[PDB]
Design a binder for this molecule. Structure first.
Ligand SMILES: NC(=O)c1ccc[n+]([C@@H]2O[C@H](COP(=O)([O-])OP(=O)(O)OC[C@H]3O[C@@H](n4cnc5c(N)ncnc54)[C@H](O)[C@@H]3O)[C@@H](O)[C@H]2O)c1
Ligand SMILES: [K+]
Ligand SMILES: [Mg+2]
Ligand SMILES: [Mg+2]
Ligand SMILES: [Mg+2]
Ligand SMILES: [Mg+2]
Ligand SMILES: [Mg+2]
Ligand SMILES: [Mg+2]
Ligand SMILES: [Mg+2]
Ligand SMILES: [Mg+2]
Lengths: 51, 110, 39, 171, 58, 71
RNA sequence: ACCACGAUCAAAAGGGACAAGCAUCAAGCACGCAGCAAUGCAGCUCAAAACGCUUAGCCUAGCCACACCCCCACGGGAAACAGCAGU
């Protein structure tokens, strides 16, 4: 009974983990979008200076 | 279930694979310093039978006691490789990881 | 010293106790060889 | 080493670099640059050959590749400057720092550790367990103790045949 | 529990967890991420600790 | 500060260098004899090994080198 | 009593544990593993103190060791109070 309760406690914590990881991807994508924009301008500027 | 070997289950780090079908495993236990009352690691070496020679130096293994020792110093057999060196699978998620970072996201398989 | 250092060295070891002229004994028997005075 | 005609890492992706005068291509090649520019091309070659993301310069893989290029440059320097103690120190320190990186990469990502060793030609070695001078007395005795063992093994085999032969005669 | 082997492992996985090895061969995985140290102690007491009755008897 | 502790060490080292100078020929004869015994003590240690292993003579082709001579 | 297909007590054997000082005792020198065997591999211990020297009966409801000496005791040296009283 205690081993089964422990497996159920792990599954509950796992559902919270999946919810926490989904909220972190949305934030990671936003940051990753800006860095690519900034990084693209810095490349275009660096490319124009070299050209 | 009975065995003449004192240590029935022990976890340790593989530190040698130069013996045929035998892994040399460093097992650490916490021992209380009576004067300082602080716990310090005390390490002991155990030889473990590795029939398939699957043990790599540095991986964490679980050793099970044999019913009777099979050699002068071989009193245990490899029961399970807990943490393969550099190829750890996170038990909490089942996904491969490299240190504290996931190699496959737990969100891949939902 | 650090706790790790105190652990490694362990309890302080006393120097072994030196035996005096009686060799750790209350009295000794002797045979007189010569008598004289000292300054 | 990359060919001297190789363009600099900065000018390789500018549009129209293939239609400029030959003189302009020489001035933007490795031939007209210092050795540090040739090392940037080598590092980029290894990064694309080995690492999964060639633009991740902070990964443990990229650091090992960057440091491996420096190590090769020091070895080339010391091949011509054999009394340069300053650079001999930098080489030995760099080799030690790479070994520490490889140890940490082996412990965290073995599949990547193997590709780094194959790609860079590194033979990973485990450190010796004890650090102590092997002086003349020990070197000589260890050699004698190995010879004594080898001779004892031969004698123990010639005491198996004689016993085997005598046993057969009884029959 | 002086006869229970306790071994620690740093930064091998992305989240912290406890794992118990029992004499039968069963393994008990306890996820401890997000839990306080007091909650971890109460959890392992519940699933693998002797109750107050068993200790009073001894 | 004062240099009295340095001065004690200075005099000790001076008298030692002076003693070594006066007796450098006796000390050289003593050092030679010690190295001979050191070589003999080393040779015995190797002979003990093969004798305790069951061999009656040194391993074939083995000659114990002189590891303490200036050469 | 007799057997308990047991209980109690407790050897041999296997596993674990177990004094102090000296590292100016730092290397030990066969100290490992596999295999039914043949035989094969070259390993095993060690500064987290191996190997070694020295000191000491111990963890005292008591325990260990010894029992003239040669660790032992066929044998030998030799002729035994470290049982009590006694010299
Ligand atoms: N002696 C070794 O080969 C060795 C091996 C692993 C770890 N260590 C560690 O080194 C430290 C020094 O140990 P000690 O006080 O017994 O030795 P020490 O300083 O008395 O030196 C004795 C021997 O160990 C070597 N040594 C000294 N310092 C060392 C170090 N930091 N790492 C490796 N070897 C070293 C010396 O060269 C010599 O051969 C300790 O922390 C020990 O755990 C030593
Ligand atoms: K005796
Ligand atoms: Mg003086
Ligand atoms: Mg017994
Ligand atoms: Mg030291
Ligand atoms: Mg001395
Ligand atoms: Mg005594
Ligand atoms: Mg006797
Ligand atoms: Mg007597
Ligand atoms: Mg009496």
């Amino acid at each position: 009974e205690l081993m089964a309760w422990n497996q159920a406690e792990n599954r509950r914590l796992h559902e919270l983990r999946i919810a926490r990881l989904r909220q972190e991807e949305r934030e990671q994508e936003q940051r990753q979008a800006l860095e690519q924009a900034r990084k693209a301008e810095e490349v275009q500027a660096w490319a124009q200076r070299k050209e | 279930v009975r065995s003449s070997v004192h240590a029935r289950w022990i976890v340790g780090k593989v530190i040698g694979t130069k013996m045929q079908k035998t892994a040399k495993v460093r097992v650490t236990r916490l021992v209380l310093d009576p004067y300082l009352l602080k716990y310090f690691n005390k390490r002991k070496t155990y030889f473990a039978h590795d029939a398939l020679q699957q043990c790599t130096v540095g991986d964490i293994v679980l050793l099970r006691a044999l019913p009777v020792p099979r050699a002068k110093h071989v009193k245990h057999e490899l029961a399970e490789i807990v943490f393969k060196v550099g190829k750890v699978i996170d038990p909490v998620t089942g996904k491969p990881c490299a240190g504290t970072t996931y190699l496959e996201s737990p969100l891949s398989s939902e | 010293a650090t706790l790790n250092q105190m652990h490694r060295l362990g309890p302080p070891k006393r120097p072994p106790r030196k035996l005096g002229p009686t060799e750790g004994r209350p009295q000794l028997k002797g045979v007189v060889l010569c008598t004289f005075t000292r300054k | 080493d990359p060919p001297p005609s190789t363009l600099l890492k900065d000018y390789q992706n500018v549009p129209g670099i293939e239609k400029v005068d030959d003189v302009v291509k020489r001035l933007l090649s490795l031939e007209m640059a210092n050795k540090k520019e040739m090392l940037k091309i080598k590092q980029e070659q290894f990064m694309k050959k080995i690492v999964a993301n060639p633009e991740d310069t902070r990964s443990l893989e990229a650091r090992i590749i960057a440091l491996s290029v420096k190590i090769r440059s020091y070895e080339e320097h010391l091949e011509k400057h054999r009394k340069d103690k300053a650079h001999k120190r930098y080489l030995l320190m760099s080799i030690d720092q790479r070994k520490k990186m490889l140890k940490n990469l082996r412990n965290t990502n073995y599949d990547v550790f193997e590709k780094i060793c194959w790609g860079l030609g590194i033979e990973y070695t485990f450190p010796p367990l004890y650090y102590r001078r092997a002086h003349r007395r020990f070197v000589t005795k260890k050699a004698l103790c190995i010879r004594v063992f080898q001779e004892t093994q031969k004698l123990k085999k010639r005491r198996r045949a004689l016993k085997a032969a005598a046993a057969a005669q009884k029959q | 529990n002086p006869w229970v082997q306790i071994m620690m492992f740093k930064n091998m996985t992305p989240s912290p967890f406890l794992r118990f090895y029992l004499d039968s061969g069963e393994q008990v995985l306890v996820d401890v991420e997000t839990k306080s140290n007091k909650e971890i102690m109460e959890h392992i007491r519940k699933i693998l600790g002797k109750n107050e009755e068993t200790l009073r008897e001894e | 500060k004062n240099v009295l502790k340095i001065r004690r060490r200075k005099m000790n080292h001076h008298k030692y260098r002076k003693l070594v100078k006066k007796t450098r020929f006796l000390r050289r004869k003593v050092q030679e004899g010690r190295l001979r015994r050191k070589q003999i003590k080393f040779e015995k240690d190797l002979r003990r090994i093969w004798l305790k292993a069951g061999l009656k003579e040194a391993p074939e082709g083995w000659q114990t080198p002189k590891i303490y001579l200036r050469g």
